[PDB]
Amino acid sequence: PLIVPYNLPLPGGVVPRMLITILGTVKPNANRIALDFQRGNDVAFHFNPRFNENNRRVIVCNTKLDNNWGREERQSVFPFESGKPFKIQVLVEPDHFKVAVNDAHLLQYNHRVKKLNEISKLGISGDIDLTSASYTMI
């Protein structure tokens, strides 16, 4: 089991055709998960499943620039389930991050941070047992 929060370096940042795979199991009674693709202190892409926001389950995505969150993008399709194993795949494409969970397309997030080769860390946080985090080129 990897330690959470986990820091996965992305050497030289990200690039289209780069596929990031995260495997884990959601804890019983989970409240939150977060993936943070960071450019230094900025968060280029925050992917944040919330298991209980006003008694609804929602995915919140955003960007943090100069310590300020921007406009959220919200996805009510919610593929996670407390207690169950999951796979998150984040495929970097030219205009967006494309996210699939358990081999089903979930959402795309347009690139707000444009210096892809500076987005050189992925943080993984929240209410999971983390099994593996890796990347490959497809």
Residues that bind Cl ion (CB under 5 A): 32
Residue with tokens 């494309």: 98
> 55: phi > 0 → left, psi -120 to 50 → alpha, else beta; which?
left
Q: Name the closest residue to ligand J3Q (Cβ).
A: 126
Find out whether 53 is annotated in a ligand binding site. Answer: no
Residue 10 vs 33, nearer CB to ligand J3Q: 33
Q: Which does 29 bind (CB under 5 to 8 A by kind): ligand J3Q, Cl ion, none?
A: none
Site string for ligand J3Q, 119-138 (x = CB under 6 A): ------xx------------
Among residues 78, 81, 75, which one has the least CA distance to residue 25?
A: 81
Dihedral of the CA atoms 131, 50, 115, 24 (nearest 10)? Answer: 10
Residue 18 vs 123, nearer CB to ligand J3Q: 123
Token duo for residue 91: 């495929």
Dihedral of the CA atoms 102, 108, 111, 115 (nearest 10)? Answer: 20
Q: Which residues are annotated as a binding site for a beta-D-galactoside?
A: 69-75
Binding residues: 69-75
Residues binding ligand J3Q (CB under 6 A): 32-34, 46, 48, 60, 62, 69, 72, 125-126
